[PDB]
Copies of this chain bind each other. A is one copy, B any other.
């Protein structure tokens, strides 16, 4: 199940402590065993954001209610609607052709005024991610039940007695993956994505704040059509739900339940501190067989590529030789691997793995394995554009 720890990942001092680096990814786990000591399976479980705070609320499907139009004959100054006293009504002062047929003195421009009640049927919510909202749950399995603990960015360390290992301090910080700072959690009544903060602000839709409950910038979903002497019909523009869904293609969708817990991606770099202890360092070989694409490589909103492979061999457990090259005539590592340890669990028949890499901008080949039987994939990465 869990892949053993390697020699490079731990240092036993001649006197003092034995420090061991743990790379806890959502995919696989790292197990650490020691002579005359119980084996410890280190598996991360929940990378979440407990509770979020709302920043803004844009409206895409607005509905106009009560209308009222007051007009006055030309050469009599201006027209004034008595709904402007209430800031919850959007109004517009215009001019119309006037004559004897409508009931006025001179054939001129008669000033009018038309107000309408602005309400919002369906709205979208934008939420922010703060440091006191992030939690990480790590499970530890023992052989020879389990013991679980949690760590936050405010409390990254955890000390606990683990039997024959004595007191153990586990200091873990979060790395790689997404950058929670430059992102907002966009929420439609159905799904939820992650958008850029500047992309969120720069949006010409009627919005409201938890501090300012009254809607602002409403003059973008309302349309004042051709005015008449009596009634100037103003209508509510169509639902902008389609436009948003069209604008949210390259946005990365995060799983959000009713408790607003945000399941995210990335990895967790942890270091375990123990008393002086010798540890078995297992070293895994290379996969000499051939891999095949389980499906088409997807793409997340942070310029990384998720690729699901399936190994056709029994040399497990081994290390996947995946690299992103420039051309088929170059084995030059012009790409990078987000997944630090791309090992296969067991060697039982046909298994599958979940690897994530960062290819350079432009044309690049995702190549797995070598020799005569290797496969590749032409990938074109787009530049940054909100």
Seen from chain A, the residues whose Cβ lies within 8 Å of a Cβ on chain B are 6-19, 21, 23, 50-56, 74-78, 80, 95, 108-109, 111, 128, 130-133, 135, 149-160, 167-169, 173, 175-179, 181-182, 198-199, 202-204, 209-212, 273-276, 278-279, 281, 283, 302-304, 333-338, 340, 357-358, 360-361, 383-386
Asked if A132 and B303 make an inter-chain contact with CB atoms under 8 angstroms apart, the answer reads yes
Q: How far is A126 from B199 in the complex, measured between Cα atoms in Å? A: 14
If A77-B95, A361-B50 touch, does A279 touch B132 (CB 8 Å cutoff)? Answer: no
> Could you say which of B8, B152, B279 contacts A358, with CB atoms under 8 Å apart?
B152
> Are A7 and B11 within 8 A (Cβ)?
no
Q: A336-B152, A340-B157 are in contact. Are A175 and B173 (CB under 8 A)?
A: yes
Bound together, the chains give a CA A80 to CA B198 distance in angstroms of: 37
Option from B128, B169, B384 in Cβ contact (under 8 Å) with A132:
B384
Residues of chain B with a CB closer than 8 A to A302's CB: 131-132, 154
Task: Determine whether the beta carbon of B179 is less than 8 Å from that of A384.
Answer: no
A337 → B minimal CB distance (Å): 6
* 7 new A-B contacts at CB < 8 Å, known A54-B385, A203-B211: A11-B12, A74-B77, A77-B111, A130-B179, A130-B182, A133-B384, A154-B336
B202 near A358: Cβ-Cβ < 8 Å: no
* Bound: A146/B86 CA distance, A: 70
* Distance of A167 Cα from B8 Cα, bound (Å): 8
If A53-B386, A95-B80, A179-B131 touch, whether A12 touches B15 (CB-CB below 8 Å) is yes
Q: Are B108 and A154 in touch, CB under 8 angstroms?
A: no
A274-B8 CB under 8 A given contacts A149-B333, A386-B53: yes
CB distance from A243 to the nearest CB of B (A): 11
Could you say which residues of chain B place their CB within 8 Å of the CB of A80?
Answer: 95, 109
- From B10, B175, B202, B304, A156 is in contact (CB under 8 Å) with B175
Q: How far is the CA of A56 from the CA of B198 in the complex (A)?
A: 9
Q: List 9 A-B contacts (CB under 8 A).
A: A6-B167, A11-B18, A16-B18, A16-B281, A51-B384, A53-B383, A77-B108, A78-B95, A132-B384
A76-B75, A77-B95, A132-B303 given; A11·B8 CB < 8 A? no
Note all chain B residues with C-beta closer than 8 A to A169.
Answer: 8-9
Q: Which B residue's beta carbon lies closest to that of A341?
A: B159
Which B residue's beta carbon lies closest to that of A51?
B383
Given contacts A74-B77, A202-B209, contact A154 B177 (CB under 8 A): yes
Specify which of B150, B333, B335 is in contact with A334 (CB 8 Å cutoff). B150
Contact between B14 and A385, CB atoms less than 8 A apart: no
> Which of B15, B157, B167, B384 makes the CB contact (< 8 A) with A130?
B384
A292 CB, nearest partner CB in chain B, Å: 24
The residue in chain B whose Cβ has the minimal distance to the Cβ of A178 is B131
